[PDB]
C-alpha cells in the first residue's frame, strides 16, 4: 500500500508540471525503493547502505569512507555493475555486453 501511495504521489508531481511519463519508469523507481522491506531513501544514507559492490557505492557522495569500510570489512566486489566495469575500463554487462560471442568450428566448414 506504501508502493501504491508512493507512485500516486510521484505521478501527481509529474502531472503538477502537467507532463506525461509511462507507468513503467515510475513503477520501476517505486518498486526499487520498496523491495528492501520498507521505504528506502534516495541519498548517501539511502542506497549507499546497500549490499552492492563497494566500487559502485563509492561513485556517489561517501567515497574515501566507503573505500575505508571496504578495506575494513575485507569487502568483495563482484564486478557485475556498470560503475565497477567503467572504473576498470572494460565492456560492461549492459546492453551490447550482456551476451557473449563464439565461433563454431562446424558451421565454419559448412559455409564455403
Partner 1 sequence: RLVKALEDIMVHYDNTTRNSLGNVIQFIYGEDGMDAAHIEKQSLDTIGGSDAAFEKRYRVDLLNTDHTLDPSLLESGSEILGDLKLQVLLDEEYKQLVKDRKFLREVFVDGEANWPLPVNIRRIIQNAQQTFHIDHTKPSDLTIKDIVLGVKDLQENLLVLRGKNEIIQNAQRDAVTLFCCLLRSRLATRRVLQEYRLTKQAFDWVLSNIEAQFLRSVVHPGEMVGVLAAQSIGEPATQMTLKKVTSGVPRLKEILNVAKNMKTPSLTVY
Partner 2 sequence: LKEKAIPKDQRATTPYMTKYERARILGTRALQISMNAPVFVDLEGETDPLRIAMKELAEKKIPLVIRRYLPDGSFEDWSVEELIVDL
Partner 3 sequence: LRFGEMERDCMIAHGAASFLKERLMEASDAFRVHICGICGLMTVIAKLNHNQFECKGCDNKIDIYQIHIPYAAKLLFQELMAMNITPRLYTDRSRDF
Footprint of partner 2 (CB under 8 A):
93, 95-96, 98-104, 107-108, 111-112
Give the whole-angstrom CA distance, residue 81 versus residue 97.
12
Q: Which is nearer to partner 1, 102 or 108 (CB)?
A: 102
Whole-angstrom distance, CA of residue 22 vs CA of residue 26: 7
Give the Cβ contact number of residue 6 at 10 Å.
Answer: 18
Site for partner 3 contains 89 (CB under 8 A): yes
- From the list partner 3, partner 2, partner 1, none, partner contacted by residue 62 (C-beta under 5 to 8 A by kind): none
Residue 49's SS3 state is: helix
Q: Which CB sits closer to partner 3, 12 or 51?
A: 51
Nearest distance from C-beta of residue 71 to partner 3, angstroms: 4
Dist CA 3 CA 27 (whole Å):
8
Half-sphere exposure (Cβ direction) of 35: Cα atoms closer than 13 Å: 10
Dihedral pair phi/psi, residue 57, rounded to 5°: -60, -30
Residues that bind partner 3 (CB under 8 A): 67-68, 70-71, 76, 78-79, 82, 86-97
Residues that bind partner 1 (CB under 8 A): 6, 9-10, 12-14, 16-17, 19, 21-29, 31-32, 35, 39-43, 46-47, 51-53, 56, 59-60, 78, 80-84, 94-96, 98-99
Amino acid at each position: 500500500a506504501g508502493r501504491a501511495a508512493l507512485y500516486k504521489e510521484v505521478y501527481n508531481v509529474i502531472a503538477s508540471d502537467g507532463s506525461y511519463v509511462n507507468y513503467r519508469h515510475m513503477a520501476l523507481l517505486v518498486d526499487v525503493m520498496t523491495t528492501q522491506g520498507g521505504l528506502t531513501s534516495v541519498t548517501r544514507h539511502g542506497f549507499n547502505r546497500s549490499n552492492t559492490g563497494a566500487l559502485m557505492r563509492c561513485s556517489f557522495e561517501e567515497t574515501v569512507e566507503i573505500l575505508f569500510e571496504a578495506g575494513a570489512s575485507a569487502e568483495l566486489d563482484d564486478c557485475r555493475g556498470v560503475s565497477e566495469n567503467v572504473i576498470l575500463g572494460q565492456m560492461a554487462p549492459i546492453g551490447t555486453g550482456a551476451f557473449d560471442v563464439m565461433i563454431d568450428e562446424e558451421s565454419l566448414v559448412k559455409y564455403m
